[PDB]
Every structure is written in C-alpha cells, then in structure tokens.
C-alpha cells in the first residue's frame, strides 16, 4: 500500500478543479488458445 | 457502534447521473433552465423600471 | 502511511470525500436555490 501506482492517466491535462489524487493502476488481460490437453474416463454410473 | 443489517441504511435517489473526469455528476431538471430563466426575470425587471 | 489514529483515518476519508461534495454539491444545493427561494444570487438589499 506504500507503493503508489501510475499510468497514462485517463482524465486530461486541463485541471481547473479539486481532484489531484491520480492513483491510476491498470489491469491487463491477455488471451491464448494454446491447445491444452486430454483425459477421458468412463461413467461408472448406469453405464453410458 | 454496530447497527443492524449488512448495508448502509441510506438509499439515494438520482435524476441524471454519470461520471466524466472520473468525477461524479448528477442533476435535476432545473439546471438547464437557470440560464434563460434569469434572463426572463432580468429583462422583466428592466422593463419594469 | 501507517497512522492508526481513529478520528484521523475517519476525518481523512470525509475530508477526502468532500473535495467532491465540493465541485458538484456546489451546483446541486443551488438549484435548491433557484427554486425553493429567489432566482437572484449574491446581492442583498
């Protein structure tokens, strides 16, 4: 909690107001199909 | 001092609401009218004199 | 920082929370003005 993040800052430059607590931090999602793998079994219950 | 249930006992009613600079914004209907409404009043008063 | 003074953590989340009851609450309570009262502002008598 004593680190304090930062970023490109979504607001603006202007700054004719009463908010200076930037404290911006971003969340980065990434995606991949990857072709993971396997593992089949047999339903022990009533066959099928 | 522990009060009852598991929420803040304060429900808020809004008119038009949203965020901008990431600052909270809301308003009633009246806001838009204030501008010409004084004009009305004014010209009124002027003509009264 | 670490400053577990109770009225300091609390008054420093209100004081942090009224810098916004500023920019906005300034306009808001004033509509309650152009209406429930005179539409003239800032000069008396």
Write structural notes for this entry.
The structure is cut from a larger assembly and holds three copies of chain A. The first copy, chain A, is largely without helices or strands. Chain A contains no helices and no strands. The N and C termini of chain A lie far apart (about 55 Å). Chains in contact: A-B, A-C, B-C. Chains A and B meet through loops of A and loops of B. It is classed as viral protein. Keywords: portal protein, molecular motor, Podoviridae, virus assembly, tail tube, Viral Protein. The entry is titled "Full Length Bacteriophage P22 Portal Protein".
What can be said about this structure in brief?
This is part of a larger assembly, with three copies of chain A. With 48 residues, chain A is largely without helices or strands. The PDB classes it as viral protein.
Main attributes?
48 residues; little secondary structure; 3 chains
In terms of topology, how is this protein built?
The structure is cut from a larger assembly and holds three copies of chain A.
Chain A: no helix or strand
């Amino acid at each position: 909690a004593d680190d304090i993040p930062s970023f490109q800052n979504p607001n603006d430059w202007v700054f004719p107001w009463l908010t200076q607590d930037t404290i911006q931090i971003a969340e980065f999602y990434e995606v991949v199909e990857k072709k993971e793998t396997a593992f089949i079994y047999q339903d022990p219950v009533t066959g099928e | 001092q522990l009060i009852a249930g598991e929420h803040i006992p304060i429900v808020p009613v809004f008119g038009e609401w949203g965020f901008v600079e990431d600052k909270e914004v809301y308003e009633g209907v009246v806001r838009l009218t204030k501008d010409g409404q004084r004009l009305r009043n004014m010209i009124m008063s002027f003509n009264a004199d | 920082e670490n400053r577990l003074e109770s009225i300091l953590s609390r008054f420093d989340a209100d004081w942090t929370a009224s810098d916004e009851a500023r920019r906005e609450a300034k306009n808001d309570l004033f509509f309650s003005r152009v209406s429930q009262w005179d539409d003239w502002l800032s000069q008396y008598t």
